[PDB]
């Protein structure tokens, strides 16, 4: 019973203590619905934290750290109970234990604590967890331990309100540059996810990632044999190409577009959608980057997904087509027209999603304004596939922007 466990765990006889702590750990590690609240309310937390101090009984340290790990794996309230019991400084102490298992379990507990949230993360950082954590990365580290270390790095990178301190990123990026060469799938997935969390933190963090020199090793993972690695890399590089034209060009210079045929035809529709999102962020760039998309022979696949893909992919494809018109040249838009973009691009004007409608209208207006002599031909193409009737119908749209743009389109190009 919990009363008996708590009483025996406060004993001065460390054998009885160890037995009681192991009983608590068993309760906490037998299934996926442990009685965390009952053990907390019984008053076992300060006892476990005190056990963490017993450098003369590494078994007791290990068992208490296991119990606290599983308590901290629960809700934010339970993790914060652990934190309020002052466990973090003692886990940091245990990071330097001469016993491997104690070190590992302390790393695991700190991982749960850090993963709770950004304020928790910042508290653990201010006490100096990063350098000792990264010191474990050596040729002799066991693979399971290294997987746990990389998971903790993920947790150190992932929250955004606020993002981790710049000093922390400067310490972590070299370790990620080391780990991105590992062939173990788990380590690689977590490394790339940590990178993706850094590249989603802002343009300055994007630039820190670029300056580390890791991007040429990250881009080729778009064609890794493991789909988890592929999608993690797609997230990270996509984040990068949400930035400036120069950062996007850093990505493109690593031959990123060569990896996308196998992603646009992938059986998984979510992957198609994410790849088209990436490419839409590419087509929003300068004429050279639009031309990089064109030369990669990706436009026909994009247009096919626009025509026949699932709705999500069609939305992303509409974004890509329209973004191409931002800085695209008249000959590039003419290539699009040649590839039969108008019929499906206009077909997407009848969906409930008002944002898609706005995007398609913006793209069509840019196409028409860009064409001087072709304008009449493009108008005829729009009318032939029924797009003009859809625009006339949109003239009566609820959304202010949509119907104003429809009126403008019709008045400037379909009213003479």
């Amino acid at each position: 019973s919990l009363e008996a466990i708590v009483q025996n765990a406060s004993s001065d006889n460390q054998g009885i203590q160890l037995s009681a702590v192991q009983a608590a750990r068993k309760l906490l590690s037998s299934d996926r619905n442990p009685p965390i609240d009952d053990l907390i309310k019984s008053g076992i937390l300060p006892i476990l934290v005190h056990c963490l101090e017993r450098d003369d009984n590494p078994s007791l340290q290990f068992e208490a750290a296991w119990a606290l790990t599983n308590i901290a794996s629960g809700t934010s309230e339970q993790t914060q109970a652990v934190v309020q019991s002052n466990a973090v400084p003692l886990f940091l102490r245990l990071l330097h234990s001469p016993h491997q298992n104690v070190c590992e379990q302390a790393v695991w507990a700190l991982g749960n604590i850090i993963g709770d949230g950004p304020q928790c993360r910042d508290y653990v950082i201010s006490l100096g967890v990063v350098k000792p954590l990264l010191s474990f990365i050596s040729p002799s580290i066991p693979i399971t331990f290294l997987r746990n270390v990389t998971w903790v790095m993920v947790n150190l990178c992932r929250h955004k309100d606020p993002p981790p301190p710049m000093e922390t990123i400067q310490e972590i990026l070299p370790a990620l540059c080391v780990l991105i060469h590992h062939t173990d799938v788990n380590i690689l997935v977590d490394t790339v996810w940590a990178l993706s969390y850094l590249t989603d933190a802002g343009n300055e963090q994007i630039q820190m990632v670029i300056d580390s020199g890791i991007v040429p090793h990250l881009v080729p993972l778009l064609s890794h044999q493991e789909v988890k690695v592929q999608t993690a890399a797609l997230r990270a590089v996509g984040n990068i190409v949400t930035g400036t034209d120069e950062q996007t060009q850093v990505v493109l210079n690593c031959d990123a577009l060569s990896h996308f045929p196998a992603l646009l035809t992938h059986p998984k529709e979510k992957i198609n959608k994410e790849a088209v999102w990436f490419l839409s962020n590419i087509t929003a760039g300068n004429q050279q980057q639009v031309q990089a998309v064109i030369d990669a022979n990706l436009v026909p696949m994009i247009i096919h997904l626009l025509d026949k893909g699932d709705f999500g992919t069609q939305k992303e494809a509409a974004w890509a087509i329209s973004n191409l018109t931002i800085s695209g040249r008249k000959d590039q838009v003419a290539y699009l027209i040649q590839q039969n973009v108008i019929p499906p691009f206009c077909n997407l004007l009848t969906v409930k999603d008002a944002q898609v409608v706005q995007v398609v209208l913006d793209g069509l207006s840019n196409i028409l304004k860009m064409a001087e002599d072709e304008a009449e031909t493009i108008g005829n193409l729009i009318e032939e596939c029924g797009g003009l009737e859809k625009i006339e119908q949109l003239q009566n749209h609820e959304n202010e922007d949509i119907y104003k743009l429809a009126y403008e389109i019709i008045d400037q190009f379909f009213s003479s």
Partner: peptide, 26 residues
């Protein structure tokens, strides 16, 4: 308006968990 966009909701749903319990026999 047109332009670049950040990661959209629903994309990349298989992220690493923030918390892990150590379960006996797993």
């Amino acid at each position: 308006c047109l332009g670049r966009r950040v990661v959209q909701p629903g994309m990349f749903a298989d992220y690493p968990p923030t918390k892990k319990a150590r379960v006996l026999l797993r």
